[PDB]
Structures are given as C-alpha cells and as structure tokens.
Symmetry: C4
Subunit: 454 residues, 4 copies
Amino acid sequence: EEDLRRRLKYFFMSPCDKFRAKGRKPCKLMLQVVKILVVTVQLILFGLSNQLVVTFREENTIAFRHLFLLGYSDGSDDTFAAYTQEQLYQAIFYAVDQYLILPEISLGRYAYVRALALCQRYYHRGHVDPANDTFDIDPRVVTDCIQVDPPSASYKNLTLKFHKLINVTIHFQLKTINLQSLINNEIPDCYTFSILITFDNKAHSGRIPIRLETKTHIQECKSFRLLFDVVVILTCSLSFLLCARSLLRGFLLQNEFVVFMWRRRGREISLWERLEFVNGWYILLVTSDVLTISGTVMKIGIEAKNLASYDVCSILLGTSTLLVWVGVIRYLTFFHKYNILIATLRVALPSVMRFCCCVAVIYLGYCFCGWIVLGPYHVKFRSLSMVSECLFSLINGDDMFVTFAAMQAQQGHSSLVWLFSQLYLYSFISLFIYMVLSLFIALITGAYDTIKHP
Amino acid sequence: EEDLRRRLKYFFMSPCDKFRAKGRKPCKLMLQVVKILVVTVQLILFGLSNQLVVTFREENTIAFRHLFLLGYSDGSDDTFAAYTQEQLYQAIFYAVDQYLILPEISLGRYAYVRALALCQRYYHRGHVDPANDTFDIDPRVVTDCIQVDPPSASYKNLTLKFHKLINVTIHFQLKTINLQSLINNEIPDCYTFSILITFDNKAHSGRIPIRLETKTHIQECKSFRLLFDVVVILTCSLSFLLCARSLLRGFLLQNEFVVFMWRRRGREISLWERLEFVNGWYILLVTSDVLTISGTVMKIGIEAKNLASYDVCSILLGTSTLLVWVGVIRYLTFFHKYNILIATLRVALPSVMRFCCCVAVIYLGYCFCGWIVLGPYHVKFRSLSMVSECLFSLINGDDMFVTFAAMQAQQGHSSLVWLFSQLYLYSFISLFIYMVLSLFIALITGAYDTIKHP
Amino acid sequence: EEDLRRRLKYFFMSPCDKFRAKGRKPCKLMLQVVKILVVTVQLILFGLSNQLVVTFREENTIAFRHLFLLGYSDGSDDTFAAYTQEQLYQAIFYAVDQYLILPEISLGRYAYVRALALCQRYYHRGHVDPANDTFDIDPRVVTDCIQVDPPSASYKNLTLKFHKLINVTIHFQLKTINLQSLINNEIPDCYTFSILITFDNKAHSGRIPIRLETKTHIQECKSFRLLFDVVVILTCSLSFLLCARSLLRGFLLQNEFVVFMWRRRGREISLWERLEFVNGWYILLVTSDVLTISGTVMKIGIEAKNLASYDVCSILLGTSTLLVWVGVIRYLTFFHKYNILIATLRVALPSVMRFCCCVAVIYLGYCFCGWIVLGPYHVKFRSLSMVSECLFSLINGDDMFVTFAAMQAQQGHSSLVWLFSQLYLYSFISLFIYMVLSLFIALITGAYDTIKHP
Amino acid sequence: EEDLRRRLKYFFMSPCDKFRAKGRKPCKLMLQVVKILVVTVQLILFGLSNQLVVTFREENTIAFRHLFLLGYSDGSDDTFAAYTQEQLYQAIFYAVDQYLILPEISLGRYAYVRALALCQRYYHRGHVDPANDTFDIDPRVVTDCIQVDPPSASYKNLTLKFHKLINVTIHFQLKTINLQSLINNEIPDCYTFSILITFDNKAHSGRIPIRLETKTHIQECKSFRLLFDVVVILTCSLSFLLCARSLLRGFLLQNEFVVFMWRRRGREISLWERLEFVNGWYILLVTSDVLTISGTVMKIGIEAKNLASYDVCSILLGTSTLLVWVGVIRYLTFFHKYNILIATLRVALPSVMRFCCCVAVIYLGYCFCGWIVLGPYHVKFRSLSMVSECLFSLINGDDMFVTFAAMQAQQGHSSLVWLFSQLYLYSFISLFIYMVLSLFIALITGAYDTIKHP
Ligand SMILES: *[C@@H]1O[C@H](CO)[C@@H](O[C@@H]2O[C@H](CO)[C@@H](O)[C@H](O)[C@H]2NC(C)=O)[C@H](O)[C@H]1NC(C)=O
Ligand SMILES: *[C@@H]1O[C@H](CO)[C@@H](O[C@@H]2O[C@H](CO)[C@@H](O)[C@H](O)[C@H]2NC(C)=O)[C@H](O)[C@H]1NC(C)=O
Ligand SMILES: *[C@@H]1O[C@H](CO)[C@@H](O[C@@H]2O[C@H](CO)[C@@H](O)[C@H](O)[C@H]2NC(C)=O)[C@H](O)[C@H]1NC(C)=O
Ligand SMILES: *[C@@H]1O[C@H](CO)[C@@H](O[C@@H]2O[C@H](CO)[C@@H](O)[C@H](O)[C@H]2NC(C)=O)[C@H](O)[C@H]1NC(C)=O
Ligand code: NA
C-alpha cells in the first residue's frame, strides 16, 4: 500500500522538522541535554573526592619510606638495593628499631594494631658447591617467622642463611585518623595501613632490592550527593526505556518493507539495504545508559563504605561520560555546514582502515626485528611492550636523540650492531614520516573533494 | 540622488589611491608608523628595567634559602620536608641561630628592622584517641606567639604540641641597598625584604614541608624616559581622537543608504549588508589606544615609586604592543600578491571554527575520561588542568615516551588499568594526528583553491 | 604459435583464480601461512630465553661495580675518574681488599678460579723535562705484573711511576651458579665471569677514568624447542625448493617469447619488457628462506652450548622475520580496494627517490659545515656521527631547545659563533620543515590522483 | 645581423650538448668535480686535527676544576657559589694550598711558570649605612695585589673587606707536554695554560659564584698536508680565473643585444630581460673560490704555529664546503625528471617569501608580548633571545609540557598571569600549527601543479 510508505516518512524525518506538522515540542531532546549535564557533574564531584583520598595515601606512604628505610632520598625507588652482608643486617635492624620507638619519631597519631611478624624464607635443602659442580636442591620453601610486640635478644641473634635465601618480609599495621574531614564538618574516616617491607632475592644476582608497599581499608569511626545519585540513576534509566521503545519501532517497521518487497518483488536485497534502516546513534545511547547505571550503583556501594575496589567504578563512569560527550555531534549534524564536515569522516573511515592494515603489518615487522636485535644492547627495547611504545613514540617524533645517543655511547658492543642500528632507525623513521603519513593526508583530502564537488 | 553615491567612493577607496585626485599626502599613515615605533621602544626600555629588578630579588631569595634552611642544595624546593621530631626542632633553631649572628655570616649590608616573631598555631581542644576512636575537636585556632630581639632560655624551652598542630611561621624583615644604581649614576633604590618561613602541616600526613617566601617594597633613599612617556601618551591619544572621527563619518554616512534604500526600495536588507560598511581595522586601533594610554599612566605611577603592582602595567603594555604589531598586515594587503594570501585566511576562518567545535567536544571527552581513570595511577593526570596540558602536548607530540614509561613501570597497580592505558593512549594519538590534523590541511587547501581559480 | 600464448595465461593469472579451472586448491598458500606462524613463534621463544640470560649478566655486573669500585652510586659510569695521587692508590687497594674477603662481603656463592694478576704498563725510557723542553722517549711498553692468591707486603709496597704511565689493569675470574634454572626443572648453567678493571691513562690529561668490564662463558654442570627447530628448518627448506621450481619455470618460459618476438619480429625489446616477466615477490621469499635456515642452524649451535657468539644468530633471525612479515602485503593486493592503495606506493617510489638525492646533498652540506664550526663549542656536534643524528633528530623536531640553550649559555666563546649559530640553526630548521617536507606531501598526493582518476 | 643571434646559441646551450658539435670534451666539468673532492678531504683532515686538540684542553680544564675548587662534582658549573664568610675564605686557601703542593697531587708533568698573583679589588671610599640611609661612594677601583712563589703569614693574614668588594681573581700559568704526538711520530706541541679563578661579586646579591677559566698558547719544543694544501689553493684559484673569463663573456655579449634592440627597436626593456641573461650559478662558484683560498691561507698560518685564532679559519672553510656541496644540484638539473622537481622550488620560493613576511610580523608580536609578561614568572622567557628560541621550538613542538608545567607549579604568583598563560600559549600553538603550516603545505602543492600540468 501507499500508506505504509508514509509510516517511514515520520521515522526518517529529523526531530527538528516535526514541530511544524504534529506540534509536539521535543522532551526527548531535553532528556538528552539533562543526561549530558547530570552525568558530567556526577563525574566531577566523584573525581574531586578521590583526589583528596589518594593524596593522603601517597603522602603517608612517602612518610613511611623516610621512616623505615635506611638512607632514602627521593628519586631512588627503583635503584635502591643492598650489596653487602652488613648492609642487609643494618637495613633490617633499622626498620624494627624505627618501629619500636614510633610515637616520638613520628609526626602524627600513629597508633599500633595488635604485631610485627618478621620472617625469612629459605629452601629445604640448599646444597650448592661451585668448587665441585655437584648439588642437591629441594624446592620446598621453609617459612621461618618470629614475633615482635611493642610496648633485646628475643629479637636479636637473628641469623640469615645467605647460601639459601628467597625473601625477607616484614608485616605490620598502623591506624591513623584523617584530620581534613573534621574541617569538612562530617563523620571522620579512619585509615588502616598495611605496611609490607620486602627484601627480594628472587633472581639471585648478588643484588637485593628494597621496596615498601602499603594498603588501606577505610572504616567509619564515631545527602546532596545521594539525592543527586538517585537523580542520575532515574533520568538515565528513563532514557534507556524510551530509546528501547525507539528500537522496538525499528524492529517492527522492518518487516513492513520485507513484506512490501515481496509484493513489489524487490528481489530480497542483501545485508546493506536492511542495514541502512535501523539507527546510527541509539546503540551508543543504550550502551551509555547500561554503563552509567552500573557505575552509579557501584558508586553507592563505594561511598556507603562497603567498597573494596575503586577500579571498576572509575572505569565505568569514565567510559560512560566519554560516550555521552561524543553523542553531542549528532546534534551538530542537523545543520548543513556541519553535515558536510562530519560526512568527510564517514567517507574517509573505510579507506583509512584499509590502509591501517597495511601499516600494522610493517610496524609489527619492525617490532619483532628490533626487540631481538637491539634488546640486549639498548634499554628502551627490553620487552615487546616497550618496543611498540618506543617505535610509536618515534612515528610522530618524541625521543629520537636519546635512542641515537644510547646506541652512540657504548658502541653497542661490536661494530655490527651499531652499523645495524644506523640502518634500522634511519630506514624506519624515513619510511613512516615521509611516505605513510603523507598517504593519510592524501586520503582525507581526496575524501573531502569527493564529498564536496557533486 | 547620484551625488550621495559619490560620498561612498571617497571612503571606499584606499589611502594609497587618494594622492592623485585630491593631492593630500597622508599624515595619518605617518602617525600609524610612528605609533608602531614609539610603542615598541617604550616596551623594550620598560622591560630591561624589570629584568635588572627581578634578578636582584631572585638572587637574594636564593641567598636566604642557603642561609636560613638546614641542608639545602638547589633543585629541592618542592621535595624538602621534615619527617622526624628532632629534625623539625633543629630546623627551627637553625633558622633563628642563623638570624641572630647575621652580619658576620652574611655577604652584604643586611641590616635589621625593628623583630623576629616566632609563632605556632594549635587547635583549642585537640582530643584524638585512635585506641578508642572517640574524640572532641574544637576547630578554634589558638595563636601562640613569642618575640625575639637581636643585638637563651627566653627563646629556648619552646615546646610544640605534635598531637594538635597546623602551622609554625616565622616573620622578620631585612633592609638592604641596591649597589648597581650607584654605578648607573642615579638615586639608589633601597629594598625591604619580608621573609616568611613556614612549616606547613595542613593535610596532617606525617610530612611537614618547608618553604621560604620573600616580598619587597622599594622606597628611595637620599628624564629621557619621562619625556618619551609623555610623547607616547600624546601621539597615541591623537590617533584615538583622529580615528574616532573616522568612526563618526561611518556612523553618519550609514543613514544615507538606509534612506536611499527606501526610495529605491531596497527591501531593508538584514545584518550583513549593514555589517559590510563600517570598518575592519579601526576597532583594533581604538582598543590599542585605550590599552596603551592605560598602561602608560600605570607606568608613570610605577616608576614614580607609588607602585604596588607590576602585574597590570605589564599585561596592558604587552597586549597593546601585540595588537599594534598585527596592525601592520593591513598595509601589506594593499599590494595584490599579498592580498590573495591574506584572503586565504578570511575564507578559511569560518570553516576552521565550525570544525573547531567538533574537535573540542571529543577532546573534552578524553579529558574527563583520562582524569578520573588514570588520575590515581599517573602523575601528569592529577588535576584537569594538567590533563588538558598533557593531552594537548601529545596532539603535536611532546612527551609520549615518558607517559608510556610511567604506565609501564608500576604496572598501574592491576592489569586492568594498564590494559586500559594502552587502548586509551593509542586510540587518542592515532585519532588526532592522522585524521583531524589532516582535515585542517584539507580545509586550508580547498580554501586556497577557492580564492585562486576564479 | 597461439598455443604458447596460452602457456603465459596460467602463470600470469592469480592463485585465487585457479580454483575454478583446474580444481587445484592451493597448498603453496598454506605453506606460506605456516611459514609465517612458525617463524614468529620461533623468534619469540628464542627472544624470551635471551631476556632471562641478559638480565642475569646485567644485574651481576652492577653488583661487581658496587663491590670493587670506591664510592660508586648509579648514574656515574662515564663521569667517574681519579684526580689525585692518593685517590688512585686507594682505588687499587680498595679493589684488592674487596677481593680477598669476598665470600663474607658478597651475597651469593661467588667461588674463586685458580688468580688476581695486577699489572702496570710503563714506557721503556720516559724522559720528560718541561723545565728544559728536551726529552728522550722510547715507545717500547714494559709490562710489570704481580700475582695475588687468595686463601701483606708481598702485595703492598707497590710503586707506580706517574711520569711514565699508560694503563693499570686487574684480571681475575669468578664462577657462580644460575639459580633460576633449578626452578625451571632443568640442567643448570654455571657462568664464569671475566672481570677487567682498567685505570686508563691514554690521553695523559691529568684525568684517569675508571671502568669495569665483564665477560661470560657458559658451560653445563651435572625437547619441545628442538622438535620445533627441526620443523622450522624443514618447512622453510621445502618452500625454498618449491619456489626455486617457480623461478625455474620463469627462466625457461622466458625464451619462448624471445623466439616468438623474432618470428613476429618484435624488434628485440630492451631491458624493461624482459624485466616485467619474471616475478616480484619470490626474490623476497628465497632470501627469507636462506636467511631463516642459516639462523636456525646457528641457533642449534647456540643452545647446544658450543655457542661463542649471540650476534649473528640474533641479526639473521630478526631480519628473516621482518621480511616474512612484509610478505603478507602481496596477499592483501589480491583485493581491488587494497590494490589501489598499494599501487600508490609503487607510482610514488621513483619520484621520491629522485627527490631523496636532492635532499641528501644539502643535508650533507649542513653536516660538514656544522661539525667543524660548532664542534669545539657544542657537545652534540663532537663527531660527524653525532652531527647527522642531531640534525636528523631536528628534521622532525626532537630536541631543539636543548641545542639552542647550549649555544645560549656559554655564548660559545665569542659573539661570532653565536651569531653564526642563530643563522645556521634557523635557516636549517626553516628549510627542511616548511619546504622539503611539504614537497614529500605534494609528491604522494599527486601520485594518488594519477593512480585514481583514469 | 643574424650572425650575432648565433653568438647566443653557444652560450645558451648546455655543456652536455656541446660534445656532438665542436667535439670539445669538458675539462671545466672535471675541474668542478675535483674541486668538490679536494675541498671536502681538506675539510675532514683539518677537522680531525682540531678534534684531538680540543679534547685535550677540555679534559685538562675539568682536571683543574677538580684540583683547585672546594667540593666540586660534575654537573655544577653554574649553580656553585659561596654563601657564608668562612666558605669564601676556605675556598681561597684551598685553591692556593692545592697550588703549592702541585706535583705530588697532580697526575702529570705539570711544571711551573715563573707566579701566583692573588688580588682583590675594592672601592676607594665605600661608605654604606642602611641604619641611616646616608652614604658616600667613590667609584674608583683600588687594586690590591699580593705575590706567591712556590718552591706562611706572608701569604696568610689576608683580610677581605666585605662591605666594599667587587672581584677576587687569581692568576697563574702551567706548562705541560702533549704525549699523544710522540705516539704519532712527530715534533711535540707543548701547551701553556692560563688559569683564571674568579670570585665574582658584581651584582652584590649575597651570592658569590665561583668559576675557573683557562686559555692555551701552543708553541713547538725541540708534508702530506702541506702538499695537499698547495693543491687546494692551486686548483680552486684556477677555477676562479676560468669562470671569471665566463663572466667576462657575459658582460661583453650583453651589449650586442642592447645594440640589437635599438636597431630592431626593442623599446629598451627593463630590469628582468637584462637579468635573465648573465648566469645563475657562477656567482655561487666565485664566492666559493674567494672563501676557500682565504680559509686555506689562514690554515697555513694556523698549522705553522703563528695561529692565534681558530675562529675565522673554521668558519670560512665550513661555509665554503657548504656552498661547494649545493653546487652539485646544477648537474642534477640537466636531466629532465630532476628538472621538474627543482623547478618546483623556484616557482614556490617567491610566494613562500611573501608569506614569510606575514608570519614574522605576528611571530614578533608574540615575542614582545610574552617576554615582558611571562618574564619574571617563567625561566625560559628571561631575555628576548630565549623567547624567540622557545617559541620557535614550540612551532614544530619540542618542549610544550615543560613550559606548561612551569606555569602550573608556582601558579605564577597570582591567578591573573596563570589565566593569561593558558590563553597565550593555547592561542599561539593552535594558530601556527594548524593554519600557518598548512598554508605552507598548500603553497608548495599549488606550485607543483602549476609546474606540472602545462
Ligand atoms: C618470597 O618468596 C616466596 C617463595 O619462596 C613467595 O611465596 C610465594 O608467593 C606466591 C604469591 O605471593 C604464591 O603464589 C606462592 O604459592 C608462594 N610460595 C609458597 C611456597 O608459599 C613470597 O610471596 C615472596 N614474597 C613476596 C613479598 O612476594
Ligand atoms: C597556618 O594555618 C592557619 C590556620 O590555623 C592559617 O590561618 C588562616 O589563614 C587564612 C589565609 O592566610 C585566613 O583566611 C584564615 O582566616 C586564617 N585562620 C585563622 C583562624 O586566622 C595561616 O594562614 C596558615 N599559615 C600560612 C603561612 O598560610
Ligand atoms: C693499556 O695500554 C697498553 C699499551 O701500553 C695496551 O696494550 C695494547 O693493546 C692493544 C689492544 O688491547 C694491542 O693492539 C697492542 O698491541 C697492545 N700493545 C702492547 C705493547 O702490547 C693495553 O691493551 C691497554 N689496556 C687496555 C685494558 O686496553
Ligand atoms: C672584577 O671587577 C673589576 C672592576 O672593579 C674589573 O675591572 C674592569 O674590567 C673590565 C674588563 O675586564 C675593564 O673594561 C674595566 O676597565 C676594568 N675596570 C677597572 C677599574 O680596571 C675586572 O675585570 C673584574 N674581574 C673579572 C675577572 O672580570
Ligand atoms: Na624531551
């Protein structure tokens, strides 16, 4: 019938044009704009909260490194290790003697938790004899703990076994009180640090690094956010249901052309002419709404102090706000002069992906080559992750002279890998800057002329 | 009438063409060139003066940090803090004992000002008990000062309260004499420093940073600039009045087409055909003249020693000289071969702004996403200011490998934010370098061809 | 005959099209895909092995620098030297006294090798008299060794001759046992370090640098890889023989057109019409197969502990995997929409090489100029290698501000080389960024339009 | 006459085409190729000589800083200063006591020169009273020397006057013998250092920096280059005379068209049709020959030990070799496919200069603005030289994040210059990267199409 062709002309016409005919001023538009504003304000007010939470942990952890580590100035987290026997002993006894007299030496209300369990782990039968090259090593690990309670030889006379040694760990806990919350006129948030000091001897290289790790677990001692959080779940869920009804109309009006192309005998057209009917942005909207309400329920769990994980709530709210922001562009394309420029992206996106395959093959070629060859001689080419980050930083040009000076200084070791380094880096840089990037310029330019001139 | 169409042909014709007809060689041109030269010379002679003023304050302030701070080598302004109890006491008593014997230890004529008022600020009732989680904190701040006069136990027996502590400040003043002015054969400029040493304990993290701040207030003890300053106010004010008469002729000859398009019945054309009549550069000239004379009156107030603020005079003279310089281009466009190239900018400026909206939406998307997600795990993503500076530095390519190595080193903490970091940074960099920047190249190129071929 | 024109139409048709006619589904295709996969897995499993081998040597060598060198913190490999007489003596006696008591001071099973041969090398007749400017120097080198055996004055009373001195070297060896292999449940790999400490006085400048060098030689004490290695030699050799038969058909069907262009009288066409017949990728395949089997036989020699050289096996496997990866593109060009984009590279590669000559002449001009002129005054322009690396890093833009600040700080020495530095660097940067790189953009763009429009 | 039109056709035809007609195979071509080769070899053999000369001075000067300066580790040339009274005294007495016992403490044959003249310079009448603000300062400088001869109270009891002080300088000289020349089997080159230690108190800021400066004067104690140097002066002078005869033919055959355009009545054409007749590369050749022979005569003066100045010989030989290298391009343009690409540069060079004016005006606008405004608050914007180097490093993108972090850290001081810093740097970077650089791309592209299509 000719009536069902008129069923399409409502759905195909823009929301801007449907004020003259039916006189329905859009509320769905206003729900979209309110959803933008309410999500972004919810993101900012959450993010400032974690800013004041994280800097308290970071500043206390630096304060523990200056209290419990022997000879520590900042800038030496990684390159800090014990190299002699007495230096490892004096590191251990400095840590515990700077634990027992804590409240005088500290600069806060660091209280104890009922405490310090020192322990070393050595192999069951570590028999090593490089004067005979015969051995008998039993890989069972023997834990050997010792207990320390705060208010000598019960703690002293501690004897390591340096011919069989894996780790020396120190566990204790400290409870403090956050003081900024009392300025903010609220219920305080007492923290409980879990300090772990580890003398790792994993590789057995004659070098024992030292590192300190903490972990907190907040619990309350003796609103505007919560009302705003039930708003952001309510409006965004209503947008989920409303545009689910729009997908309902798409999937039900799909059949009335398939019926209609059998009576008109439209030859049962393939994938594209049923692809060009449904939608182009409401998929982005519906995954924004699922992602938003999952993050906000997770946030209510966070700030009601049954929390245990900052990671999932942060990543879901961040990705949700990102997709809500790129949902603005579809309102820009209702104007003509913007619709040309956005159409340049869609006519250029297939050909730029067809070229992206031919780039990634050669790029992975130089990754696998440079990692094995310049691995033992450079320091930015240790693992394949660092190789891909280094080469892709050199595509645009970030750090060329430091890589060339690293191969210039030590001469690799032989002349062959230096002669290979010059040819490797010059061929790579001159390939991808001059030819490949200029093909990206030519593809976007030709796509612009194609969308322009007819 | 046909006579009023001839009223337009004088105003519409260039200043270069009006030497043949009326024989008036331009003086308005020469006032513009003199205004360029006199403003720039006034800027340079002012800027060299503040160069010798600022380096004296900077070098003295470094000299105070080496005199009054315990164990200070340069490069440690930020990461310098007290971590134990005796270190904070020895920092205070080092500061005052390096104040009392000042003239032997100093390397100048540092005189005293009648002096040192040491003080600490503690809460009214600071009751903290982490062994009970009960408390009573009164947020009233109790100031507790003590006075020190230079030529023990009146200053000694100073007892802090480390369970209730906010700040420990030290105020004193020092007067010296600038010696370079006597070489310049003039009246000297005695300075008065206001040294503030602060032991901040704001966040209560177990870490008390130390910083020193000074402030000067110049006052005289027992020309060519001033004549040049009354010149630069006089000529620039005359240009303000002269081009105000040009805007007067524009606003009065506007009506004689509006009358004329009612008798010819020109249908009362909209905004653009009355926009294309007035001017295109004299708005820039008139705001240059207002800005110049405001800055120069401010400068006379500065160098007549009733000064109090370097900020407004510096920013007004700087912006005024900038706009005077970009007023040169309108003399370049009287030639034909330059007029083509300047017309490329005006035909490309609308479309590049229409594209600038579609860039800024996606860019603010990646800002709000990256700040919350990679905030607690990176160090360049602490606040939203640092995120926008970091991402916009990565648009052109500044510091890619340091951001990738920061996420490579600590593994974030979990595998999920590392796996998210790789996808976030690779998608962002490959978006804005390859596609968006190439659209900027294509837009300026198509605008050039549009202005060229007809 | 017309039959021999049909001999060409099989060889000229694609492998994809020969399933409809003869019904031979391709196995040569599947040998190519298996050759890609097996080479890359062989590369990765080899590269992870050398990762755990290299970090053991690197961490032990850092541990020897902290044991045997006086006052060594990391970051001071290069700028570390002895400047007085007693400092060189105390460096030597610290090295040997930290050798004799090794097992207490060490943190491993460092055993001895039966040992320490200290030696100095002085000239035969070193007569120097700057108070007379007369001399007699005999360039014969007198080696003067001394022997030290571990469990005073036999080693003490060592007297240098500082008026005639070249080198002071210290040789000893240490055997340790790698402990990670016992966790990996295999036969261990005992290492033997060859520590060389050298006090170089080559240039005789009053500055004796200190450096430590090690060298290992692995030997066993008291599979899946090997089966996979005989697979990777077998399949890749079979591809070598199969495509050698394809080159056989090319060289034998070449003559049946040369015969045919004498009976048709095709005028004996020159180089190009016999160049366009043979192949375009099987040269790349056959050099991939030669390179692969050479590297894998070398690898079997490596991991069967008769090894002696990591260099050739690493560089042959790396280059082989690179060429195998760029052999994927020829399967992408069987599709049409990829064939256009790959044809852009071949139509642009001649003209970009014709322009690469005209770039390299001017670039070598600025290399020879900048090296002699700014050599003694900069630090990145010491040798011609560092000049070419610095200028080519400044083509794209890496490190501009550090080079400008290096010429800004010391003022060179005179005003002339500073005035020359500004003109040199501004002319170079503004040449190659604005004009030359834009010619690369224009050449690839015009090549794209040439391949597109007909 | 028609004969004089044939006088032009010899001079206008290429050197390649004149082998068929007259049969004169070119020797002028071979003199050009020999001039390229001989100049570059002369440059390299000179530059390696100054490499071994400069590193001897640099390594000895570092050795003097470690001998004569109190507490000096490398990396602290600039930030090294005395801040108390006893530190300046102990710096002076450390310098002289590390002079008197030199030969034991040194590591070479450092002999004396008959010696150490210590001196201080104080004002004639330095009356300063900040407790009264009255003074009497006489700017006459009173030199006060003292003499020290090497093999206490004659040198001790040295009393400075810290209320009137300008400089404290120390002069002495040391003669050593270069030892590498005896390995090179030649006559040695004894050096004579002129060590200057200066305690500058110029600005009178309470901070006295310390620096050490040396200066050498080589003189001999008790070839292949020289023959090659008389070759490079001989051949290059012959090219000067030969192409002077070519300019002679140009200036004499110029008149026979000016006579000919008066009898044909060619209307006495203006500047361009007499500009297009003479030459296009022999001006470059003749200034190359003048510059080469001036540098080589200067070099003969250098290496015959009456030398006194490395600067002019280095800069003349460097610029001469540069112009000789860019003289190769005119041999490339005899081929057709290179002649198109070189013609792109000449058709694009006028329009790129017409645009270079409009760039430099706005660029100098941002220079004068940013220097006065962000001068006292940044550290890369101190002088106008550093501003132009910083902004031009930010055109391509070098160091964006360090400039943004410098304005982010200290908050300037007030919110106004931070709010101005964000607007200044974002507007500048987004102007010159997106619009101006894309105009350079469009100009070279349109010039390429103009030279291509007809
Ligand atoms: C020190 O080494 C011991 C091994 O001797 C580590 O114990 C292992 O820890 C991992 C994860 O922590 C477990 O999967 C293993 O089951 C543990 N092995 C045994 C035998 O219990 C110990 O974790 C190391 N210390 C640190 C701080 O990592
Ligand atoms: C140290 O802390 C005290 C608070 O205990 C600060 O005093 C406040 O200072 C700000 C601005 O300086 C004022 O707006 C408040 O009104 C002050 N509070 C009171 C109770 O007076 C003090 O400024 C801090 N010290 C420094 C150097 O900032
Ligand atoms: C220290 O100097 C001596 C020379 O006095 C070096 O001995 C030369 O070493 C090179 C290569 O090592 C040989 O080619 C020469 O033949 C050696 N000369 C003599 C006379 O034997 C010695 O190598 C230097 N030390 C170090 C560690 O390089
Ligand atoms: C230390 O200061 C004195 C001034 O008191 C400097 O002497 C002047 O030096 C410059 C150039 O060296 C000359 O142009 C002046 O004529 C000198 N003045 C007098 C009064 O002689 C001296 O040079 C400074 N020391 C150093 C190492 O620069
Ligand atoms: Na950098």
